[PDB]
Amino acid sequence: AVMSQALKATFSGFKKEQRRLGIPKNPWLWSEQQVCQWLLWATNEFSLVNVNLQRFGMNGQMLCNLGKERFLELAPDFVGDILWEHLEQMIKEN
Ligand SMILES: [Ca+2]
């Protein structure tokens, strides 16, 4: 809500990372490696120790095809809510 709104501002940071690693703006286009790259950016950005990387061995098409419910089961507690907010914004906007 207030925390989600505030932390949404740092998501802009990933745009610099996308240009850096040649990650397309639209997640539908992402390779299994570019999905991993997004999760590694977040692991560093938000200091994580367990993004379930083995659970995200998928293309950007599969990632886009998971809904909020499946995404949150797979992703770690509270962190999943942060990642979902970023993912859904990227799908909606680019
Ligand atoms: Ca789109």
Coordinates of N, CA, C and O and ligand atoms in Angstrom, one line a residue:
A1 N 0.8 -1.2 0.0 CA 0.0 0.0 0.0 C 0.9 1.3 0.0 O 1.0 1.9 -1.1
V2 N 1.4 1.7 1.2 CA 2.3 2.8 1.3 C 3.7 2.4 1.0 O 4.5 3.1 0.3
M3 N 4.1 1.2 1.5 CA 5.4 0.5 1.3 C 5.5 0.2 -0.1 O 6.5 0.4 -0.7
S4 N 4.4 -0.4 -0.7 CA 4.4 -0.8 -2.1 C 4.6 0.4 -3.1 O 5.3 0.2 -4.1
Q5 N 3.9 1.5 -2.8 CA 4.0 2.7 -3.5 C 5.4 3.3 -3.5 O 6.0 3.6 -4.6
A6 N 6.0 3.4 -2.3 CA 7.4 3.9 -2.1 C 8.5 3.1 -2.8 O 9.4 3.7 -3.4
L7 N 8.4 1.8 -2.7 CA 9.4 0.9 -3.2 C 9.3 0.7 -4.7 O 10.2 0.3 -5.4
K8 N 8.1 1.1 -5.3 CA 7.8 1.1 -6.7 C 8.7 2.1 -7.4 O 9.1 1.9 -8.6
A9 N 9.2 3.2 -6.8 CA 10.1 4.2 -7.3 C 11.5 3.6 -7.7 O 12.0 4.0 -8.7
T10 N 12.0 2.6 -7.0 CA 13.3 1.9 -7.3 C 13.2 1.0 -8.5 O 14.3 0.7 -9.1
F11 N 12.0 0.6 -8.9 CA 11.8 -0.3 -10.1 C 12.3 0.4 -11.4 O 12.7 -0.3 -12.3
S12 N 12.3 1.7 -11.4 CA 12.9 2.5 -12.5 C 14.4 2.1 -12.8 O 14.8 2.1 -13.9
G13 N 15.1 1.7 -11.7 CA 16.5 1.3 -11.7 C 16.7 0.1 -12.6 O 17.8 0.0 -13.2
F14 N 15.7 -0.8 -12.7 CA 15.9 -2.0 -13.6 C 16.0 -1.6 -15.1 O 16.6 -2.4 -15.8
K15 N 15.5 -0.5 -15.5 CA 15.6 0.0 -16.9 C 17.0 0.2 -17.3 O 17.3 -0.2 -18.4
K16 N 17.9 0.7 -16.4 CA 19.3 0.8 -16.6 C 20.0 -0.6 -16.8 O 20.9 -0.7 -17.6
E17 N 19.5 -1.5 -16.0 CA 20.0 -2.9 -16.0 C 19.6 -3.6 -17.3 O 20.4 -4.5 -17.8
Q18 N 18.4 -3.3 -17.8 CA 17.9 -3.9 -19.1 C 18.7 -3.4 -20.3 O 19.0 -4.3 -21.1
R19 N 19.1 -2.2 -20.3 CA 20.0 -1.6 -21.4 C 21.3 -2.3 -21.3 O 21.9 -2.7 -22.3
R20 N 21.8 -2.4 -20.0 CA 23.1 -3.0 -19.7 C 23.3 -4.4 -20.2 O 24.3 -4.7 -20.9
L21 N 22.4 -5.3 -19.8 CA 22.4 -6.8 -20.1 C 21.6 -7.2 -21.4 O 21.4 -8.4 -21.7
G22 N 21.2 -6.2 -22.2 CA 20.4 -6.4 -23.4 C 19.1 -7.1 -23.2 O 18.7 -7.9 -24.0
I23 N 18.4 -6.8 -22.0 CA 17.2 -7.4 -21.7 C 16.1 -6.6 -22.4 O 16.0 -5.4 -22.2
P24 N 15.2 -7.2 -23.2 CA 14.1 -6.5 -23.8 C 13.1 -5.8 -22.8 O 13.0 -6.3 -21.7
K25 N 12.6 -4.7 -23.2 CA 11.7 -3.9 -22.3 C 10.4 -4.7 -22.0 O 10.0 -4.7 -20.8
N26 N 9.9 -5.5 -22.9 CA 8.7 -6.3 -22.8 C 9.1 -7.7 -22.3 O 9.8 -8.4 -23.0
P27 N 8.6 -8.1 -21.1 CA 9.0 -9.4 -20.6 C 8.5 -10.7 -21.4 O 9.1 -11.7 -21.2
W28 N 7.5 -10.5 -22.2 CA 7.0 -11.6 -23.1 C 8.1 -12.2 -23.9 O 8.2 -13.4 -24.2
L29 N 9.1 -11.3 -24.3 CA 10.2 -11.5 -25.2 C 11.4 -12.2 -24.5 O 12.3 -12.7 -25.2
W30 N 11.4 -12.2 -23.1 CA 12.6 -12.7 -22.3 C 12.9 -14.2 -22.5 O 12.0 -15.1 -22.5
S31 N 14.2 -14.5 -22.5 CA 14.8 -15.8 -22.5 C 14.7 -16.3 -21.0 O 14.5 -15.5 -20.1
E32 N 15.0 -17.6 -20.8 CA 15.1 -18.2 -19.4 C 16.2 -17.5 -18.6 O 16.1 -17.3 -17.4
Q33 N 17.3 -17.0 -19.3 CA 18.5 -16.3 -18.7 C 18.1 -14.9 -18.3 O 18.4 -14.5 -17.2
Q34 N 17.3 -14.2 -19.2 CA 16.8 -12.9 -18.8 C 15.8 -12.8 -17.7 O 15.8 -11.9 -16.9
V35 N 15.0 -13.9 -17.5 CA 14.2 -14.1 -16.3 C 15.1 -14.2 -15.1 O 14.9 -13.4 -14.1
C36 N 16.1 -15.0 -15.1 CA 17.2 -15.2 -14.1 C 17.8 -13.9 -13.8 O 17.9 -13.5 -12.6
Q37 N 18.2 -13.1 -14.8 CA 18.9 -11.8 -14.7 C 18.0 -10.8 -13.9 O 18.5 -10.1 -13.0
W38 N 16.7 -10.7 -14.2 CA 15.7 -9.9 -13.5 C 15.7 -10.2 -12.0 O 15.8 -9.4 -11.2
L39 N 15.6 -11.5 -11.7 CA 15.6 -12.0 -10.3 C 17.0 -11.8 -9.6 O 17.0 -11.6 -8.4
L40 N 18.1 -11.8 -10.4 CA 19.4 -11.5 -9.8 C 19.5 -10.0 -9.4 O 20.1 -9.7 -8.4
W41 N 18.9 -9.1 -10.3 CA 18.9 -7.7 -10.1 C 18.2 -7.4 -8.8 O 18.7 -6.6 -7.9
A42 N 17.1 -8.0 -8.6 CA 16.2 -7.9 -7.4 C 16.9 -8.4 -6.1 O 16.9 -7.8 -5.1
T43 N 17.6 -9.6 -6.3 CA 18.4 -10.2 -5.2 C 19.4 -9.2 -4.6 O 19.6 -9.0 -3.4
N44 N 20.1 -8.5 -5.5 CA 21.1 -7.5 -5.1 C 20.4 -6.2 -4.6 O 20.8 -5.8 -3.5
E45 N 19.5 -5.7 -5.3 CA 18.7 -4.4 -5.1 C 18.1 -4.4 -3.7 O 18.1 -3.4 -3.0
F46 N 17.4 -5.6 -3.3 CA 16.7 -5.7 -2.1 C 17.3 -6.7 -1.1 O 16.7 -7.0 -0.1
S47 N 18.6 -7.1 -1.3 CA 19.4 -7.9 -0.5 C 18.7 -9.2 -0.1 O 18.4 -9.5 1.1
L48 N 18.5 -10.1 -1.1 CA 17.8 -11.4 -0.9 C 18.8 -12.5 -0.7 O 19.9 -12.4 -1.1
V49 N 18.4 -13.6 -0.1 CA 19.2 -14.8 0.1 C 18.5 -16.0 -0.5 O 19.2 -17.1 -0.7
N50 N 17.2 -15.9 -0.9 CA 16.5 -17.0 -1.5 C 15.4 -16.6 -2.4 O 14.2 -16.7 -2.0
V51 N 15.7 -16.3 -3.6 CA 14.7 -16.1 -4.6 C 14.8 -17.6 -5.1 O 15.9 -18.2 -5.1
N52 N 13.6 -18.2 -5.3 CA 13.5 -19.6 -5.7 C 13.9 -19.7 -7.2 O 13.1 -20.0 -8.0
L53 N 15.2 -19.5 -7.5 CA 15.7 -19.5 -8.8 C 15.4 -20.8 -9.6 O 15.1 -20.8 -10.8
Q54 N 15.5 -22.0 -8.9 CA 15.1 -23.2 -9.5 C 13.7 -23.3 -9.9 O 13.3 -24.0 -10.9
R55 N 12.8 -22.6 -9.2 CA 11.3 -22.5 -9.5 C 11.0 -21.6 -10.7 O 9.9 -21.6 -11.2
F56 N 12.0 -20.7 -11.1 CA 11.8 -19.8 -12.2 C 12.7 -20.1 -13.5 O 13.2 -19.2 -14.2
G57 N 12.9 -21.4 -13.7 CA 13.6 -21.9 -14.9 C 12.7 -21.9 -16.0 O 12.2 -23.0 -16.5
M58 N 12.3 -20.7 -16.5 CA 11.3 -20.5 -17.5 C 11.6 -19.3 -18.4 O 12.3 -18.4 -17.9
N59 N 11.0 -19.3 -19.6 CA 10.9 -18.2 -20.6 C 10.1 -17.1 -20.0 O 9.2 -17.3 -19.1
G60 N 10.2 -15.9 -20.6 CA 9.3 -14.7 -20.3 C 7.9 -15.0 -20.7 O 7.0 -14.3 -20.1
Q61 N 7.6 -15.9 -21.6 CA 6.2 -16.2 -21.9 C 5.5 -17.0 -20.8 O 4.4 -16.6 -20.5
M62 N 6.2 -17.9 -20.1 CA 5.7 -18.7 -19.0 C 5.5 -17.8 -17.8 O 4.5 -17.9 -17.1
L63 N 6.5 -16.9 -17.6 CA 6.5 -15.9 -16.5 C 5.3 -15.0 -16.6 O 4.5 -14.9 -15.6
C64 N 5.0 -14.5 -17.8 CA 3.8 -13.6 -18.1 C 2.5 -14.4 -18.0 O 1.5 -13.8 -17.7
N65 N 2.6 -15.7 -18.2 CA 1.4 -16.6 -18.2 C 1.0 -17.0 -16.8 O -0.1 -17.5 -16.6
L66 N 1.9 -16.9 -15.8 CA 1.6 -17.2 -14.4 C 0.8 -16.0 -13.9 O 1.1 -14.8 -14.3
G67 N -0.2 -16.2 -13.1 CA -1.0 -15.1 -12.5 C -0.4 -14.8 -11.2 O 0.6 -15.4 -10.7
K68 N -1.0 -13.8 -10.5 CA -0.5 -13.4 -9.1 C -0.4 -14.6 -8.2 O 0.6 -14.7 -7.5
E69 N -1.4 -15.4 -8.1 CA -1.5 -16.6 -7.3 C -0.4 -17.6 -7.4 O 0.3 -17.9 -6.4
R70 N -0.1 -18.0 -8.7 CA 1.0 -19.0 -8.9 C 2.4 -18.3 -8.6 O 3.2 -18.9 -7.9
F71 N 2.5 -17.0 -9.1 CA 3.8 -16.3 -8.8 C 4.1 -16.2 -7.3 O 5.3 -16.6 -7.0
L72 N 3.2 -15.8 -6.5 CA 3.4 -15.7 -5.0 C 3.7 -17.0 -4.3 O 4.5 -16.9 -3.3
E73 N 3.2 -18.1 -4.8 CA 3.5 -19.4 -4.2 C 5.0 -19.7 -4.4 O 5.7 -20.0 -3.4
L74 N 5.5 -19.5 -5.6 CA 6.8 -19.8 -6.1 C 7.9 -18.8 -5.5 O 9.0 -19.3 -5.2
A75 N 7.6 -17.5 -5.5 CA 8.4 -16.5 -5.0 C 8.5 -16.5 -3.4 O 7.5 -17.0 -2.8
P76 N 9.5 -15.9 -2.8 CA 9.5 -15.9 -1.3 C 8.6 -14.9 -0.7 O 8.2 -14.0 -1.3
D77 N 8.2 -15.2 0.6 CA 7.2 -14.3 1.3 C 7.7 -12.9 1.4 O 8.8 -12.6 1.5
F78 N 6.7 -12.0 1.2 CA 6.8 -10.5 1.1 C 7.5 -10.0 -0.1 O 7.1 -9.0 -0.8
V79 N 8.6 -10.7 -0.5 CA 9.5 -10.4 -1.6 C 8.7 -10.7 -2.9 O 8.7 -9.9 -3.8
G80 N 7.9 -11.8 -2.9 CA 7.0 -12.1 -4.0 C 6.0 -11.0 -4.4 O 5.8 -10.7 -5.6
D81 N 5.5 -10.3 -3.4 CA 4.6 -9.2 -3.5 C 5.3 -8.0 -4.2 O 4.7 -7.4 -5.1
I82 N 6.6 -7.7 -3.8 CA 7.4 -6.7 -4.4 C 7.7 -7.1 -5.9 O 7.4 -6.3 -6.7
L83 N 8.2 -8.3 -6.2 CA 8.5 -8.8 -7.5 C 7.3 -8.8 -8.4 O 7.4 -8.4 -9.6
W84 N 6.1 -9.2 -7.9 CA 4.9 -9.2 -8.7 C 4.5 -7.8 -9.1 O 4.0 -7.7 -10.3
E85 N 4.6 -6.8 -8.3 CA 4.3 -5.4 -8.5 C 5.1 -4.8 -9.7 O 4.6 -4.1 -10.5
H86 N 6.4 -5.2 -9.7 CA 7.4 -4.9 -10.8 C 7.0 -5.6 -12.0 O 6.9 -4.9 -13.1
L87 N 6.8 -6.9 -12.0 CA 6.5 -7.7 -13.1 C 5.2 -7.2 -13.8 O 5.2 -7.0 -15.0
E88 N 4.1 -7.0 -13.0 CA 2.9 -6.6 -13.6 C 2.9 -5.2 -14.2 O 2.3 -5.0 -15.2
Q89 N 3.8 -4.3 -13.6 CA 3.9 -3.0 -14.1 C 4.6 -3.1 -15.5 O 4.2 -2.4 -16.4
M90 N 5.7 -3.9 -15.6 CA 6.4 -4.1 -16.9 C 5.6 -4.7 -18.0 O 5.7 -4.3 -19.1
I91 N 4.7 -5.6 -17.6 CA 3.8 -6.3 -18.6 C 2.8 -5.2 -19.1 O 2.5 -5.2 -20.3
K92 N 2.2 -4.4 -18.1 CA 1.2 -3.5 -18.4 C 1.7 -2.3 -19.3 O 1.1 -1.9 -20.3
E93 N 2.9 -1.8 -18.9 CA 3.5 -0.6 -19.5 C 4.4 -1.0 -20.7 O 4.4 -0.2 -21.7
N94 N 5.2 -2.0 -20.7 CA 6.0 -2.3 -21.9 C 6.0 -3.7 -22.3 O 5.1 -4.0 -23.1
Ligands
CA1 CA 2.8 -5.3 -22.7

